[PDB]
Design goal:
Strand content: 15-25%
Family: Belongs to the protein kinase superfamily. Tyr protein kinase family. FAK subfamily.
Subunit structure: Interacts with ARHGAP26, GRB7, DCC, PIK3R1, PXN and SRC. Interacts with the ARP2/3 complex.
Number of helices: 10
CATH architecture of the largest domain: Up-down Bundle
Order of helices and strands: EEHEEHEHHHHHHHEEEEEEEHEE
Subcellular location: Cell junction, Focal adhesion; Cell membrane; Cytoplasm, Perinuclear region; Cytoplasm, Cell cortex
Number of domains: 3
Helix content: 25-40%
CATH topology of the largest domain: Acyl-CoA Binding Protein
Structural class: alpha+beta
Protein name: Focal adhesion kinase 1
Number of strands: 14
Shape: globular
Largest sheet: 8 strands, antiparallel
Distance between the termini: 22 Å
Length: about 350
Amino acid sequence: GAMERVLKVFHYFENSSEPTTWASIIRHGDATDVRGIIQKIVDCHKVKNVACYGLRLSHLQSEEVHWLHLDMGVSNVREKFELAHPPEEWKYELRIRYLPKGFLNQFTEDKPTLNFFYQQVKNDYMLEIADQVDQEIALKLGCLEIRRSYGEMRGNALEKKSNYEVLEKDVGLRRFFPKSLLDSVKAKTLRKLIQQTFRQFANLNREESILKFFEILSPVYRFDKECFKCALGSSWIISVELAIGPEEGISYLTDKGANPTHLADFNQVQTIQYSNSEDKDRKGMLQLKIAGAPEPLTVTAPSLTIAENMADLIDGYCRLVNGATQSFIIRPQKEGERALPSIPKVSETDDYAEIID
């Protein structure tokens, strides 16, 4: 629009508000790209690992997700998805998506990022598995968040009923523990289990609490890779599940619980070329030219949305491991080749992004 260019971006940089509420309001221009939106948010929190962050668009009433590539124009994206469904039904969310090898060690030297990643993974934990994990695991993770959140509290404070009551009655234990834990244990017993569990973590500082949380969660929940149902090959097409992450590089899965089988490291990917089959129901294809392999790795995704999301992921990792700011995706030249959509074809410039605090 003209004055409709105000974008709300939800994020995981903590403040005193409601977590479901953490967001920045950004006024942008007609030429601002995703890269500019990301940069402005993360520089405001003094992030070092800028290359880790992406922007995910989801429809509040679908499981569908759109990862917005850094070079996509904001107004282009908004106009395209506002043709599908109106503005109020979309959520734009800043997320860490491209993890360096050894990400935890690296994030320890960038506290805003370590904290953001923690809040991100905690949110997904509480939403997707906290009601199902072992109650001992849910007790410990909840106790760690208490320890981290109330950093100045003396380590034995929760032994006092009057202190525990503030968490139970005023704050709400739902902030830290799943409904199923709270609905299934008597209140007095829950109090005792919390007080006791908390003792093993009572002397941990905020960073140590965060690192302990990841240590305890990693066994029961993978938050360091994404998986895609797709198919590999150019002649014979074999259906697979790809597992993409810092430990896997690009891998494929075989048996439930077996180590993934390695295909390629991110640092061997030279180019990424996107194409669409010419079928009435067009297929999304990615060709990855891999250093040392004469044939490209060809991936056929079940939809164009999925292929675009996979391209964002793989390109993000290429940029990250090579320390590059530019994309490795190459321009379409032949029949059926495609670019990713919505790329365009002191603060009065039309790419300005400004946070409205």
